[PDB]
Every structure is written in structure tokens, then in C-alpha cells.
Amino acid sequence: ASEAKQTVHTGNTVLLMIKGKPVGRAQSASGQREYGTTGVYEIGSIMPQEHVYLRYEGTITVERLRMKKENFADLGYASLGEEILKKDIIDILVVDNLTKQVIISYHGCSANNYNETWQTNEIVTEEIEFSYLTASDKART
Amino acid sequence: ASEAKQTVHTGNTVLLMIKGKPVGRAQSASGQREYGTTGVYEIGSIMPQEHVYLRYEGTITVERLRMKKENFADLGYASLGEEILKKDIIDILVVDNLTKQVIISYHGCSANNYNETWQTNEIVTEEIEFSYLTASDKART
Amino acid sequence: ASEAKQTVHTGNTVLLMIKGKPVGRAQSASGQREYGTTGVYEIGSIMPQEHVYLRYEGTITVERLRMKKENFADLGYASLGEEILKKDIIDILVVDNLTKQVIISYHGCSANNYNETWQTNEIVTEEIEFSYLTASDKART
Amino acid sequence: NFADLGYASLGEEILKKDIIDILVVDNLTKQVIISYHGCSANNYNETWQTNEIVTEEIEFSYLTASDKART
Amino acid sequence: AITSVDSYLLSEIKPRLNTVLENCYIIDEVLKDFDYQTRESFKEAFCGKNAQHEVTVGFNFPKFKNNYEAHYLIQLGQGQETKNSLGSIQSSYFEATGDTLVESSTAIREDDKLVFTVSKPIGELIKVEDIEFAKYDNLQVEGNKVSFKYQTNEDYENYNANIIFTEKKNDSKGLVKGFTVEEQVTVVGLSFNVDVARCLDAVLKMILISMRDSIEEQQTFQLQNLSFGDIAPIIEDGDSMIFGRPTIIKYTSSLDLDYTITQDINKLTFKERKD
Amino acid sequence: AITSVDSYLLSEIKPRLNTVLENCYIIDEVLKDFDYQTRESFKEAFCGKNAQHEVTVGFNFPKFKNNYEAHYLIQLGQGQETKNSLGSIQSSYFEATGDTLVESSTAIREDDKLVFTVSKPIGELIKVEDIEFAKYDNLQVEGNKVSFKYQTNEDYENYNANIIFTEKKNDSKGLVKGFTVEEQVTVVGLSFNVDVARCLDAVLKMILISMRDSIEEQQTFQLQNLSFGDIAPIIEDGDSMIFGRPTIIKYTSSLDLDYTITQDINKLTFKERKD
Amino acid sequence: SIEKKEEVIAHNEVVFRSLTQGLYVKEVDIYSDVVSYTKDVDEALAMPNTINFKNSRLIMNLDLEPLNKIQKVIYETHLEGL
Amino acid sequence: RKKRDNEIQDFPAEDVQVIVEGNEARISMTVYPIRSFKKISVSLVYKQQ
């Protein structure tokens, strides 16, 4: 039996896709958003009379195991030097394994920092952190 | 036997409710309040002569497992871009499972930051932190 | 046998009392005091010629399990909004279970911050931090 | 306050205020450390702010300063 | 108030289990996942008011024989102390209070008030269903009845309500001494047919869920943690084996005692030093 | 909806296993690593629609004999509780909903609309394959059929599609109470020839992978964790030993119950204080 | 004799009974019209016997005998002499 | 919220009443009306010096 009213997402029901290509052996991803809320304090009140949105900052991180082929450097998505200046924006999509419907998409993603670890006793891993213009959860049912 | 004089609250005796809707698969929530107490020091005393309240800052966090439906983004409570500017305030209520009486309510809640984690070996989780104008524990017996 | 010359205090020989009322299901409490000692350095010496007391800062924290009744909010000791401004000072007493003699008392306690945690797998807990004017260990034998 | 206590004035009442003498004192024994004679006011400043404590400042000009009665 | 978890399980299980097996609709919801063959055979056997076969429940090491066709078996299990409190103090009360009860009542027409009557003295009220008595109502308690004023409530002379209240015994104020105990209890279903055991275990899981809403569970027995063992042959020395899947239930509760205080201060005299 | 993992394994395995053994191309891909001798001997025995020998599957402690030449054996294993939720609440629904289904349908020509018909009432729609209905299409559901408007979609009178939908039962809104259970189940292949066992285990691993795409697995049974034991002689008291490599499967699932609400507020009256 | 007694009314409700069959109402349709009937007096569909409920909807069906129902539970003690 | 917007000057928090009865709810509450400034009376005294 399978009652959809209580289902949740997991690692086996999600795909990470770039330019249609599913990135392989991807391990984890985290998303952050900051609206920069600030309160307004009058003289005759310790309490904040109201809150206001001021600034939108958002970053997304991706952890991956470096495949011998189609690594982020080979794919051209990342960069290692002045080649970065010629790299255009990208959109990173999280799409449902079952229906292939979209769960959340990040628009105008741009790379922030690049990390790779070479270790003796463990598989090679690399991490990338992007900064995006806007997020979207459209194209739903 | 059940002597009410010693009972305490637990995860099985509490409900988290928004706009009447009970949020599903909610895991944890924390509440913080800062009165900004400061002392007054005279010249002829190392001791603080008195303390005074100056500033009220309060935040509440919520941890949840992303259901495939009725997630904070789908519910319209959260936001992912400029849609936030059209989102009005909300009130988050913690209500007793037994009696449906209120334990504590936060008024004029506003969103501060949004966090979601996609991981391979664990269920998806998301965290939201709100900033509220005032708290209340009224409507008791 | 029981030789009092070596006895020590423990959780089973102490009571935490406010306004005569013993607070129930209290778990822990910590007390801090800072005299702000500073040295005096002359030109012809690297060593500090003397130390002097300058400023007295002290805080006490209390951890508790939120009983369904007589919680810090219901007791009126804490506050959740502008109600705080009408709350007067209190004295928090640590008294011996055996003799009901006093061990240490804090005078002119005032609330600094308020923390409460709602969790799924554990009993609800709340923490309060107070700032006090003076401490006393009088009324002994 | 100084305005309440009359040690300082806001309006034309200042012309009705005489000189003032200030002393700085040892707390232990109420011995004198230094004294200011003939103090008269020059500047008076006041501030109000949302979450700070109200701060009152005043500037005094004096005729002489003496440190006696110590010995 | 030392809590006998084993007795509580039996008290809750026996009535609720009979009710669940009484109707067929609930059983279908419970056994929705199981195949048609096992589901209906179990229903043909135990389900319905007209069921010839019946389930039984009892404690371990009885000197008689149990219905090994289908039976619930309980044994006390381990216990542990987890959390303490300063001075072992839990709570302070001004009134000697017993259990917490839920009762149903209908409003009665007095002159100035409408009043509900309850089987025992009210002591501490907790809630009347979906009423937020305002100060002008002047809600108050008297003996075994609770009263609220009549005016601008005149449509409610026939109001039918549920009341949550506590049993009052004495005015002797006292303290509570005790601590929290983490206790484990074992439960297992028994049968000579494995399919029955699996259905039996699944039925148990549901009523455990329903017990999460009970008054005793909400107030006294909290923080369920369930653990299931592997299906095993409980017995092999017989014409056929006995199969059962043990389950382990964990609870958090307080072992409390009442300490009464007689040192009530009423007088207070100030005298100045002769000097 | 208590989940019988053991039944789910049998339901998925029996059809899929027969299909895999039916063709030879898939088996070659599965057994690509194995040597030629073992690979073809297994294929000669079980592979193909014309296979005289056949594989069987069943639960433990049966009173009959199993085909010990090649057999899959299952036993329930342990179970544990891992994660809870506040008030044990999982979800809230406005409609009584059953299983989630996938059905295939062809568009039908109505006057204003093109409609698909499904075997049961639609309840909640989830997806129609590769259609993003715009607002001008005015997608809506009616009974057991789903409809979208005809204009600027006229080429699709014969559209052939798959539909994902839920079984609707009642309009009685209710809540869900339950928690998550971490369950382990054991599976083992049996033979009197070790080579067959190794091939048999490898076949199992593949269909477990394929089950990761199943509707039930994606929605109900998540977070696979597989663990393999060492090849051991299951039996020694006979003319020849029985060899089998046990495997352990772990799952995460919810033990849920439906609580129905009848307190539907419809009227709302405001009255001012008499004073 | 009686040493102590008290009477409390648990419920006051209105129950629906068919005029033809005499069976009480067990289940009803979307608009509270009957779909199932039962002989049980107590299991019968019931609603509070309050004026506000009447204004909030007897109204719906014709083969309908709207009956009132009341429950009395009595607590008593005796000292039976020898 | 209204007080924070200065729409209402004061009110009793504890005076509210709520009752629920099947599909109906009754709500009762009180709020103090605002009072405007109406009368001023003045007198003068003339004196020498």
C-alpha cells in the first residue's frame, strides 16, 4: 500500500540536473537564503513596531565524488583560472525521480569557491558553492 | 493512575499549528527572547545600582521534514524570491494535544532565513527562522 | 556512620526556592561573577605592581523542565512582552534540604534572556538567565 | 537633575544663579582630594535616543582650583 | 504514586482490543496492506460480534493453559533511572489531589448561574470543552460542581459538555519527591500459525497508536519507543511449533511520593532591640 | 496503514523475477562478471521460457518441502523506531485517500474538452505524463475522469498517456497519527550447489535495484541498506549440505492511522457585551 | 437506607426514528437524509438537544420522528443494618 | 495590532469570551471608545506689580 498523503522526499527520490545532464555520484547539497529582516524601534517602545525585508542573499553548495570523466572542471561548469571570466550563468534543477517534475530550481547560478580534497584512505571528493540570483518553485502539477 | 500535579510537556502532547493547519512531520522548534538588560554604574560604586530593560529581540526556529506536498514553499508561508514582499505576517501557535488549549502563541511572525538540505543517506530536512513582534500566553483556563 | 567533617553538597541535598515556592523539576543552575581585576604597569617594570577591582558583573542561569502548570511564564516570574516592564525584582535562594538553612542567596535578580526548546524525542526544557545586583551568604548557623 | 535641583538653568533664570563650588572626595573617609571654586556654566547638552540611557552633560568654567585641607 | 506499567497495559488493551475486533471496517483499515487470503481468514475467525473464536491476554508464568491459537503475552522487563531533580523535588501542591478525570455533564438552571455537577469534588479544574469563560462570567467551583453566571448565556440552559477535572481529597498542602524512570516492557503474540501472528502484531501496533491520545498516556506514560524482534519458534517440543514476534515498549514516568507540611505560619510579630 | 514489508517483497519479487529469468539478454548483463562455465550452466537450467527447472520463493517454517535446488527464503527480522513528530502528527488531509495508482488512458473527444477516464475516482491528481496544463486549459477533475479544454489542443484527440492518481474514498477530512519505523528483513538463497547460490544472489541484487524505481518503494519504502553475510552450510545432516548467503534489507516507513474530525465550524456569530 | 446520593445528567440529545420501519437512524447522506437504519436505541444518530442546534439544522426528512433522549446516571450508597 | 497602529487607545484583554456549539461559535468582547476634548474653563486675576 502507498498513501501519498504522508510521503516525504529522500535521497532515492531526487535527481540533481544541470543543462539536462544528471550529475553523477552527487552526494549532498544545501541551500541558504537570507532576507535580512530588520526591526524598527521607536523612542517610546522597547518592542519592534514592525519588521522589513532589506536584502536577499542566497547560496547553494554541492558535494560530489570526482569521477574520472565529466568532473565539474571537465564539464566546463567550474573553472580553474581566467577561463572563469568566459563562463556564463547556469541553472541548477532538483527534479523528482518518480514524475520528473520539478521541486526547486535556482536561476542565474554563479560559482563562489571551489574545493577538492585528495586523501589516501577515502574516495576523492570535491565541493562547489554557488551564488544565485533567484530561486523558483514553479512548474508544479 | 494520573496525578496532574506533576505532569510535564513532551513531543507527544504538543501540536504546532499555523492558520489552523497542523504542520506535518515537524521535528523541533526553539524560541529565544532578549530583553537587553543593562546595569547602571555610578562613580562611587563598582556594583550595579540597578538594571533596566532596553530592547526586545525574539526569534523562533522550526525544523521540518519536507513532505512532497504542503511544504513551507507550497503553503505560501515561506518564499523564494520577490514573492516574499507580498507575504503578510502570520501567527504560530503551540497548542496542547489533550485539551486543544494554547500554551504559547507568537504574534506578527516574519521570516528571517530559510535553509534546506538535500542529502543522500537521510530524509530531506528544511529549517526556517522567524522574527516576531510579540509573544503571548493568554487564553488559559 | 556519618562524619560531617567531609560531607559535600549534591543534587539531593539542595533546593531552589523563589518567594518561598520551591520550583519544581529544576535541573541545573550556574552562577558567574566578574570583579574585572586589572593590573597597574609602571614604565620601569614589566611586572604588574598591583591589581585593583573595578567592576562587578554577575549572572545566574536556571534550567527547568516545563511543567504543565506553574511554568515560569504562568508564575509571573518571567515575561513574554511588555508585561516585563511591570515585573519587579526577585530574590533566588538556594537552601539546604537537610536543615533548611541558606547556602547562597541572590538579591535583586532581573531577567536577561529567555529560552525554550520544543523537541520531538525529549521532554520540553526552558532556560532563563538572570542578572543580579548582589549576592549574599548570610544567615549561617 | 541639575535643572530640577537648580544647579543648572535653561532660560533667563541663569542670571539669578550664583557661583557653585564642586568637590571631589575620597569615598572612604570623606576627605577632600580637589576643589573647584567659583564654578559657572558655559555649555549644557542633552540627548535622547531609542534604546540608550538619557545622557545629561554640562560644562563649567571656574575662577580657581585649590587642593588644600589634605595636609 | 508508583506506576505499575504492566497493569496499565492490561487495563487499556482489554477493552480497546475487544472494540477493534468487534467491527469489520476498522480491521480492513488496519489490514489494508496484507493480502486478501490472510486478511479475510483472520476476519472470518476473530472479527465481528458473532466470532466463535476469541483472543485472550495474560501475564507470564501462569499455572493454567492459555489459548495458544491466539494470545497476547506480557512480561515486565527492565527498568532504569534517567533524570533527577534538585532535592528530588517534582512539584508543590496546596491540595491533596488524586487522578485526573474526564466527565460529561449537562448544564442546570439555577437563578444566578448555570452549573454542572460531577461525580466527585472538583478540586482543580483544567478545561470545559470549548468554553473560554470571561471574567464577567465569574467561573468558580463549589464542592462537586462548577458554576458560571447566567446572563448573556441564556441559550445554554441545555448545554451538553465534557469536563476535565481532578480528584480532591484533602486541603493538606504538601510537596512531591521522586524521579523519572525509564522502563521497558515486553509484549508478544502467540500462535501455531504464523499468518495469525503477523496480523495479531499489526493490530497491536494500531492500539498502541490510539493509546497515545489517552489521558493516562498523555499525563503519566510518555515518550513511546517501540522495538520489534524477529519471528521465532517459541516452542519446539510438541506436535507443532509456536510462533511469535516479541515487541518491546519503553516508557518515561515518575515515581512520586507525597510529603505533607504542618509548619503553616500564620502569625508574625516584630519586636525591637531593647538597646 | 500498517505496512507488511514481508508481503511487499513477495508481491514485487514473484512477477519481476519470472520476467528476468524469461529472457536471456538481461541475464547476460547481470552475469557479465561471472565465468563462462557458471554463467551458461545457470542459463541452461533456469533461463528462458522453455526452462524445465524453476525457482521458488516462500516464507520460513513451512510444513511442506521447498525446492532446495533453488529457492528464495524470507524471514521478517527485527524492527525499531527511529524518528517521531510533534503530537505524532504526520499529515492532514481533506479527503479520505487510499493508494496511489498509475493508469494508462486515451483522450476522448467531448464538445468543449478532451477527457481521460480512469478505473476509479480520481481524488488527488499528481501528474499526467509530460503535460504542463496552462490556466487557459482549465484542467479539472470530475469523478473518475480528468478534463482539459479542447481549443489549441486539437491535434491530441487520440493522445495516449499515463496518469498518476490517488484512490478517493470519502470526503471525511481527518488527521494522520504515526511515526517512522526502521525495519530489517532477511533474504537468503538456497542450493546444494554453491555456484547456483552465487548466481542466485546476484540476480536478487539487480531486482532490488529495479525496485528502487517502483511506486511503492519511492512513496512508502525508502532508504535501502543492504548487508550480505558469508556463504555458510545451512544444513549438514543429509546426503549433501545446503549452501546459502543470507542478505539483510533495511527499510524506513511510517506506521500511520487515520483520525477523523467531525467538529466542522460553519457558523460564526458576534455579540457585543451588554455593558 | 440511603446515606448519600447524587444525580447527574450526562447527555441531552435528539434522536431520529423512522415512522414506518421504527428503526433508528444509523448513518445519513450528504444532506443528513438517511442511508442506514439500526434497531439500537443508543447507537442511533443523535445530536444535542439545544435551541441553537435547531437553528443550525427534523428539517430534512419526512419519514422522520425526531425524538428526545436523556441519560441519567446515579451515584448512591447504602448502610444495610443487620 | 490595532493598538500598535493607534486605531484603539485601550481595551481589556481578559474580557473576551468564546463559546462553541456544534457548527456555531459565539464571540463576546469589549473595547473602550475614544474620548475627545470638549470643555475648557478659564479664569483670570489681575494684580498690581
* DSSP secondary structure string for all residues of B59-113: EEEEEEE-BSSS-TTTTTSS-SSGGGGG---EEEEEEETTT--EEEEEEEEEEEE
Rounded to the nearest angstrom, the minimum Cα separation between C122 and chain B is 6
Grid cell in block for residue D20:
557653585
H49 CB burial (10 A radius; 0-12, 13-18, 19+): exposed
Find the helix or strand (DSSP H, E) in which F218 lies.
Answer: helix F215-219
Rounded Cα gap, residues E58 and E52, in angstroms: 20
Q: Check CB contact of C30 with chain E, cutoff 8 Å.
A: no
Q: Classify each residue of B94-121 as buried b or exposed e, where b means 16 or more C-beta atoms within 10 Å of its C-beta.
A: bbbbbbeebbbbbbbbbbbbbbbbbbee
Q: Check CB contact of B138 with chain E, cutoff 8 Å.
A: no
Q: Which residues of B touch D53 (CB under 8 A)?
A: 38, 40, 52
Q: Do chains A and G touch (3 or more CB pairs under 8 A)?
A: no
Q: Check CB contact of C122 with chain F, cutoff 8 Å.
A: no
Q: Give the C-alpha distances (Å, rounded to integers) separating E39 from E13, E43, F63.
A: 22, 6, 21
CA within 13 Å, CB half, A83? 9
Rounded Cα gap, residues F162 and F103, in angstroms: 6
CA within 13 Å, CB half, A91? 12
Chain E residue with CA closest to B4: the answer is E100
Do B131 and A37 touch, CB atoms closer than 8 A?
Answer: yes
Q: Which residues have CB under 8 Å from D62's CB, separation 6+? A: D22, D36, D37, D38, D39, D40
Do C103 and C14 touch, CB atoms closer than 8 A?
Answer: yes
Grid cell in block for residue B35:
530583553
Helix crossing, F5-22 with F194-211: angle to 10°? 110
- Cell 548570610 -> residue: C138
CA neighbor of E248 nearest in space, from B40, F80, D51: F80
Rounded Cα gap, residues D3 and D17, in angstroms: 12
Rounded Cα gap, residues A14 and A95, in angstroms: 6
Strand order in the sheet with E96-106: E96-106, E160-170, E125-128
Count C/E contacts: CB-CB distance under 8 Å. Answer: 47
Rounded Cα gap, residues C104 and E85, in angstroms: 19
Chains in contact with F, where contact means 3 or more Cβ–Cβ distances below 8 Å, are A, B, C, E, H
Q: Check CB contact of H13 with chain B, cutoff 8 Å.
A: yes
Rounded to the nearest angstrom, the minimum Cα separation between G14 and chain H is 14
**Rg of chain H over CA atoms, in angstroms?**
22
A135 CB burial (10 A radius; 0-12, 13-18, 19+): buried
3-state secondary structure of E139: coil
- Cell 503477523 -> residue: E198
Rounded Cα gap, residues A17 and A104, in angstroms: 11
Rounded Cα gap, residues E44 and E21, in angstroms: 11
Chain E residue with CA closest to B101: the answer is E127
Do B91 and B60 touch, CB atoms closer than 8 A?
Answer: no
Asked if the Cβ–Cβ distance from F267 to H25 is below 8 Å, we say: yes
The number of beta carbons lying within 10 Å of the beta carbon of residue E139 is 17
Rounded Cα gap, residues F77 and A14, in angstroms: 29
Grid cell in block for residue D41:
556654566
Chains in contact with G, where contact means 3 or more Cβ–Cβ distances below 8 Å, are E, H
Do H21 and G52 touch, CB atoms closer than 8 A?
Answer: yes
- Cell 474538452 -> residue: F113
CA within 13 Å, CB half, B38? 9
Do F119 and F104 touch, CB atoms closer than 8 A?
Answer: no
Do E132 and H19 touch, CB atoms closer than 8 A?
Answer: yes
Rounded to the nearest angstrom, the minimum Cα separation between B32 and chain C is 5
- Cell 561471472 -> residue: F34
Rounded Cα gap, residues H22 and G47, in angstroms: 9
Phi, psi of F123 (to 5 degrees): 60, -115
Q: Classify each residue of C104-117 as buried b or exposed e, where b means 16 or more C-beta atoms within 10 Å of its C-beta.
A: ebbebbbbbbbbbb
Rounded to the nearest angstrom, the minimum Cα separation between G31 and chain E is 23
3-state secondary structure of F40: helix
Task: Give the F-side interface with H, CB within 8 Å.
Answer: 263-273, 275
Do A99 and F132 touch, CB atoms closer than 8 A?
Answer: no
Total residue count of chain F as it appears in this document? 275
The strand pair at A14-18 and A21-22 is best described as antiparallel
Rounded Cα gap, residues G3 and G7, in angstroms: 14
Strand partners, F102: F164
Asked if the Cβ–Cβ distance from B55 to D53 is below 8 Å, we say: no
**Contacts from E13-22 at CB under 8 Å and sequence distance 24+?**
E13/E57, E13/E72, E13/E207, E14/E57, E16/E207, E16/E210, E16/E211, E17/E55, E17/E57, E17/E72, E17/E203, E17/E207, E20/E203, E20/E206, E20/E207, E21/E46, E21/E47, E21/E48, E21/E51, E21/E55, E21/E203, E22/E48, E22/E49
Do F34 and F87 touch, CB atoms closer than 8 A?
Answer: no
Of H23, H25, H28, the CB nearest to F273: H28
Chains in contact with C, where contact means 3 or more Cβ–Cβ distances below 8 Å, are A, B, E, F
Rounded Cα gap, residues C93 and F241, in angstroms: 76
Rounded to the nearest angstrom, the minimum Cα separation between E159 and chain H is 8
Do F241 and F212 touch, CB atoms closer than 8 A?
Answer: no
Rounded Cα gap, residues F71 and F55, in angstroms: 6
**Rg of chain C over CA atoms, in angstroms?**
19
Q: Which residues of A touch F98 (CB under 8 A)?
A: 1, 3
Rounded Cα gap, residues F261 and G46, in angstroms: 17
Q: Check CB contact of B133 with chain D, cutoff 8 Å.
A: no
Rounded Cα gap, residues G11 and G48, in angstroms: 8
Asked if the Cβ–Cβ distance from B44 to D53 is below 8 Å, we say: no
Chain H residue with CA closest to F268: the answer is H25
DSSP C41-106: --TT-SS--EEE----EEEEEEEEE-BSSS-TTTTTSS-SSGGGGG---EEEEEEETTT--EEEEE
Q: Check CB contact of A110 with chain B, cutoff 8 Å.
A: no
Mutate to test the interface with F, among E27, E32, E192, E207 (most CBs of F within 10 A): E32
CA F243 to chain centre: 30
3-state secondary structure of E133: coil
Rounded Cα gap, residues F138 and E150, in angstroms: 54
Do E176 and E91 touch, CB atoms closer than 8 A?
Answer: yes
Q: Which residues of A touch D53 (CB under 8 A)?
A: none
Rounded Cα gap, residues B32 and B126, in angstroms: 19
Mutate to test the interface with A, among F126, F163, F169, F218 (most CBs of A within 10 A): F218
Count B/F contacts: CB-CB distance under 8 Å. Answer: 47
E24 CB burial (10 A radius; 0-12, 13-18, 19+): exposed
Q: Which residues of B touch A17 (CB under 8 A)?
A: none
Asked if the Cβ–Cβ distance from C27 to E83 is below 8 Å, we say: yes
Asked if the Cβ–Cβ distance from B11 to C80 is below 8 Å, we say: no
Query: For residues C11, C15, C16 and C18, what is the CA-based torsion angle, rounded to 10 degrees?
Result: 170
Of H15, H26, H30, the CB nearest to F269: H26
Rounded Cα gap, residues F15 and F158, in angstroms: 31
Q: Check CB contact of F176 with chain B, cutoff 8 Å.
A: yes
Rounded Cα gap, residues G27 and G32, in angstroms: 8
Grid cell in block for residue F267:
457558523
Asked if the Cβ–Cβ distance from F83 to C118 is below 8 Å, we say: no
Rounded Cα gap, residues F112 and E53, in angstroms: 59
Chain A residue with CA closest to C84: the answer is A46
Rounded to the nearest angstrom, the minimum Cα separation between C9 and chain B is 25
Chains in contact with H, where contact means 3 or more Cβ–Cβ distances below 8 Å, are B, E, F, G
CA within 13 Å, CB half, B120? 11
Q: Which residues have CB under 8 Å from A30's CB, separation 6+? A: A60, A61, B115, B116, B117, B118
Grid cell in block for residue F275:
455593558
Q: Do chains B and D touch (3 or more CB pairs under 8 A)?
A: yes
Rounded Cα gap, residues G40 and A99, in angstroms: 50
Total residue count of chain C as it appears in this document? 141
Asked if the Cβ–Cβ distance from F85 to B22 is below 8 Å, we say: no
Asked if the Cβ–Cβ distance from F272 to H28 is below 8 Å, we say: yes
Q: How was this structure determined?
A: cryo-EM
Asked if the Cβ–Cβ distance from H13 to B108 is below 8 Å, we say: no
Rounded Cα gap, residues C132 and C56, in angstroms: 10
Count E/G contacts: CB-CB distance under 8 Å. Answer: 34
CA neighbor of B128 nearest in space, from B69, B80, B82: B80
Rounded to the nearest angstrom, the minimum Cα separation between C23 and chain B is 12
Q: Check CB contact of E166 with chain B, cutoff 8 Å.
A: yes
Chains in contact with A, where contact means 3 or more Cβ–Cβ distances below 8 Å, are B, C, D, F
Q: Which residues of E touch F2 (CB under 8 A)?
A: 30-33, 202, 205-206
Rounded to the nearest angstrom, the minimum Cα separation between B88 and chain D is 26
Rounded to the nearest angstrom, the minimum Cα separation between E190 and chain B is 29
Q: Check CB contact of C121 with chain E, cutoff 8 Å.
A: yes
The strand pair at E56-59 and E71-75 is best described as parallel
Asked if the Cβ–Cβ distance from A46 to C81 is below 8 Å, we say: no
Chain G residue with CA closest to H23: the answer is G56
